[PDB]
Structure formats: structure tokens, C-alpha cells
Amino acid sequence: RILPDSVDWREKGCVTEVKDQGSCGACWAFSAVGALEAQLKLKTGKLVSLSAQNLVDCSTEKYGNKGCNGGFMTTAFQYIIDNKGIDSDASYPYKAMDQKCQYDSKYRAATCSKYTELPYGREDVLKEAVANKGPVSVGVDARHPSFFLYRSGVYYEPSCTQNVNHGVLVVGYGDLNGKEYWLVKNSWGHNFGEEGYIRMARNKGNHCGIASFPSYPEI
Amino acid sequence: AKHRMVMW
Ligand SMILES: [Cl-]
Ligand SMILES: [Cl-]
Ligand SMILES: [Cl-]
Ligand SMILES: [Cl-]
Ligand SMILES: [Cl-]
């Protein structure tokens, strides 16, 4: 296999609508469902938004996760594996608050058989995974207003570190007139960035920790 | 080394 110079999973219909997590630290759950959504499309041909709320409510203390106070994409995947399913967004809609677990196997929209973690800081391996496996869940350092106020172009933040805090989804990569980037789906609604997306600097020494903790699920 | 996705 030869790696393409650019990849965009939106062009294979493997990426759902941008979501808005609202005033709730559930980025981890959106990142996890976004990665699984792509695998579901590849597996079944169906593009279905999966329930971030299912994860907030049900993948809890046993998985190190704390609902609107943060969690882990990797252990979200493990909950879906353990639970033998996750509900669709439409059946278990998102409320930007912690709720009682309400999973109902009757509305299961996807399963998960395994997940894979990529080596820390390896943007070459991240590129390979995005090209050959699908969108990849990642953490980034987003605790800078420059991130919240991003509008267009390739984002580069000299104040960034590799200590990541915010879960997002890499759905592609490319370059903008030679400025290489990662195409990142955020969960701050469509008014964020470029229609909900941010293009973050690529091959700039693991900029903002984008390749610090990548993972992706399979079905 | 992975931290929750704490300072939200
Ligand atoms: Cl957030
Ligand atoms: Cl920080
Ligand atoms: Cl939105
Ligand atoms: Cl909107
Ligand atoms: Cl944060």
C-alpha cells in the first residue's frame, strides 16, 4: 500500500454531522462515537450517529469516566465491547448532563470488537492509521483561546504542549499550499472553526499533542 | 500517562 498525500473520510460518507457538546465535558464520548461511526459505515454501509449520551451515562466509574467531567475514548470503546452494543443517537439523544444509564439493546446501532492504541508521538503511524483504518480518536491541548477562536487555515499555537486535555477525531490529513495539516472534527457545533472542523499543524513535532494518545475501534 | 479528556 502507498500512503496517499491527502485523505478525507468525509468524501467516503464515513463522518456524521458535527455535534455540539454544550456545557458538558463529554468530548471524549463524541470522539469515541465518531470513530465508531466510520467503522459502522464501512461494515454495514449505513451512516448513523451513535449515542454520546449512552457513554456519558453508562460508561462510568468502572471505566475511569466521569460523564460531563471527562473520560477516555479507549475505555469508552471497552464499555461498548463489554456491553455488546451502543444505541443510536436518535434513540438515546444527548442532553449535555449526566443521567441514569438507560441503554436498551432493542435500539442497538453498533457493536465493537476491539480497539487499537497508537504509539505516542508518532505522526507517521497516525497518518498510516488514518489512511488505512479510518478516523482516529485523539487528544489535543485545546486550553488556549486561540483554539476556541480558530476560524480558518492551518492552526499553529506556539504555547501548545504535548499534554492533551480535549478529545477530538482525526478524519483526514492534507496540506494547504505546503502547510501540512490534520483534519480534525470537533464537537463544539458548526459555529466553531471551519464548519465545526479545525486543520491542525502536522509534522511539527507532535503539535498540541495530536499524536500523543491515538486510538481507533473496529467492528 | 493518559489523563482524562480534568481542567475542563
Ligand atoms: Cl471540551
Ligand atoms: Cl494547557
Ligand atoms: Cl452542532
Ligand atoms: Cl449549526
Ligand atoms: Cl479541558
Short mmCIF file of all heavy atoms in Angstrom, two decimals, chain A residues 24 69-71 73 139 164-165, chain B:
data_model
loop_
_atom_site.label_atom_id
_atom_site.label_comp_id
_atom_site.label_asym_id
_atom_site.label_seq_id
_atom_site.Cartn_x
_atom_site.Cartn_y
_atom_site.Cartn_z
N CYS A 24 -20.83 20.75 28.83
CA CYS A 24 -20.63 19.42 29.41
C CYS A 24 -19.31 18.88 28.86
O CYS A 24 -19.08 18.92 27.65
CB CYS A 24 -21.81 18.51 29.07
SG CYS A 24 -21.62 16.70 29.36
N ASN A 69 -17.66 15.46 33.34
CA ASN A 69 -16.38 15.85 33.90
C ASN A 69 -15.20 15.11 33.28
O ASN A 69 -14.11 15.09 33.86
CB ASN A 69 -16.42 15.67 35.41
CG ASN A 69 -17.32 16.70 36.06
OD1 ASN A 69 -17.04 17.89 35.99
ND2 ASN A 69 -18.42 16.26 36.66
N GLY A 70 -15.41 14.47 32.14
CA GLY A 70 -14.33 13.93 31.34
C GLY A 70 -14.26 12.41 31.41
O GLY A 70 -14.85 11.75 32.25
N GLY A 71 -13.44 11.88 30.49
CA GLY A 71 -13.26 10.44 30.38
C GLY A 71 -12.26 10.12 29.29
O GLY A 71 -11.49 10.98 28.84
N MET A 73 -11.51 7.95 25.56
CA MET A 73 -12.02 7.25 24.38
C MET A 73 -11.74 5.75 24.46
O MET A 73 -12.62 4.93 24.15
CB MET A 73 -11.40 7.85 23.12
CG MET A 73 -11.93 9.26 22.78
SD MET A 73 -11.06 10.56 23.69
CE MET A 73 -9.55 10.71 22.76
N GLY A 139 -6.45 12.97 21.55
CA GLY A 139 -6.50 14.11 22.44
C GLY A 139 -5.59 15.21 21.95
O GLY A 139 -4.56 14.96 21.32
N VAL A 164 -2.21 16.63 26.64
CA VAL A 164 -3.50 16.76 25.97
C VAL A 164 -4.64 16.77 26.97
O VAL A 164 -4.55 16.19 28.06
CB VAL A 164 -3.65 15.61 24.95
CG1 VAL A 164 -2.45 15.60 24.01
CG2 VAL A 164 -3.75 14.31 25.67
N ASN A 165 -5.75 17.39 26.59
CA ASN A 165 -6.85 17.60 27.54
C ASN A 165 -8.20 17.50 26.89
O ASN A 165 -9.21 17.40 27.60
CB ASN A 165 -6.70 18.97 28.25
CG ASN A 165 -6.27 20.09 27.29
OD1 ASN A 165 -6.89 20.32 26.26
ND2 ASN A 165 -5.17 20.77 27.64
N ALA B 1 -0.09 7.41 31.77
CA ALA B 1 0.27 8.79 31.33
C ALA B 1 -0.96 9.47 30.71
O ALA B 1 -0.97 10.72 30.68
CB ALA B 1 1.42 8.76 30.32
N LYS B 2 -1.94 8.72 30.22
CA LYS B 2 -3.15 9.32 29.63
C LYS B 2 -3.91 9.99 30.78
O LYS B 2 -4.10 9.39 31.84
CB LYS B 2 -4.03 8.28 28.90
CG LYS B 2 -4.99 8.90 27.81
CD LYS B 2 -5.95 7.88 27.06
CE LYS B 2 -6.82 8.59 25.94
NZ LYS B 2 -8.13 7.95 25.38
N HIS B 3 -4.30 11.24 30.59
CA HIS B 3 -5.17 11.94 31.53
C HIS B 3 -6.55 12.09 30.91
O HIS B 3 -6.72 12.04 29.69
CB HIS B 3 -4.61 13.32 31.89
CG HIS B 3 -4.68 13.62 33.36
ND1 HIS B 3 -3.88 14.57 33.97
CD2 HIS B 3 -5.46 13.10 34.34
CE1 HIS B 3 -4.16 14.62 35.26
NE2 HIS B 3 -5.11 13.74 35.51
N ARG B 4 -7.55 12.23 31.78
CA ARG B 4 -8.93 12.37 31.35
C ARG B 4 -9.04 13.44 30.28
O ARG B 4 -8.36 14.47 30.35
CB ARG B 4 -9.79 12.74 32.56
CG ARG B 4 -11.21 12.33 32.43
CD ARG B 4 -11.82 11.95 33.80
NE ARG B 4 -12.24 13.16 34.49
CZ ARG B 4 -11.65 13.67 35.56
NH1 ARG B 4 -10.76 12.99 36.26
NH2 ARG B 4 -11.97 14.90 35.95
N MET B 5 -9.88 13.19 29.27
CA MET B 5 -10.14 14.20 28.20
C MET B 5 -11.37 15.00 28.64
O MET B 5 -12.42 14.39 28.88
CB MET B 5 -10.41 13.58 26.85
CG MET B 5 -9.36 12.59 26.41
SD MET B 5 -8.00 13.27 25.50
CE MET B 5 -7.01 14.01 26.77
N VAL B 6 -10.22 17.19 33.11
CA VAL B 6 -9.78 17.45 34.46
C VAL B 6 -9.80 18.95 34.75
O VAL B 6 -10.24 19.37 35.82
CB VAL B 6 -8.37 16.89 34.75
CG1 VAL B 6 -7.85 17.45 36.04
CG2 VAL B 6 -8.40 15.38 34.83
N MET B 7 -9.28 19.73 33.80
CA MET B 7 -9.29 21.19 33.88
C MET B 7 -10.36 21.78 32.99
O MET B 7 -10.21 22.91 32.51
CB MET B 7 -7.92 21.76 33.51
CG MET B 7 -6.79 21.38 34.45
SD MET B 7 -6.82 22.29 36.01
CE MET B 7 -6.04 23.84 35.55
N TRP B 8 -11.40 21.01 32.68
CA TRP B 8 -12.42 21.43 31.73
C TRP B 8 -13.11 22.70 32.24
O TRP B 8 -13.43 23.62 31.49
CB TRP B 8 -13.44 20.32 31.52
CG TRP B 8 -14.51 20.69 30.57
CD1 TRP B 8 -14.45 20.64 29.20
CD2 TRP B 8 -15.81 21.19 30.90
NE1 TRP B 8 -15.63 21.08 28.65
CE2 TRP B 8 -16.48 21.43 29.67
CE3 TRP B 8 -16.48 21.45 32.10
CZ2 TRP B 8 -17.79 21.92 29.62
CZ3 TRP B 8 -17.78 21.93 32.05
CH2 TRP B 8 -18.42 22.17 30.83
#
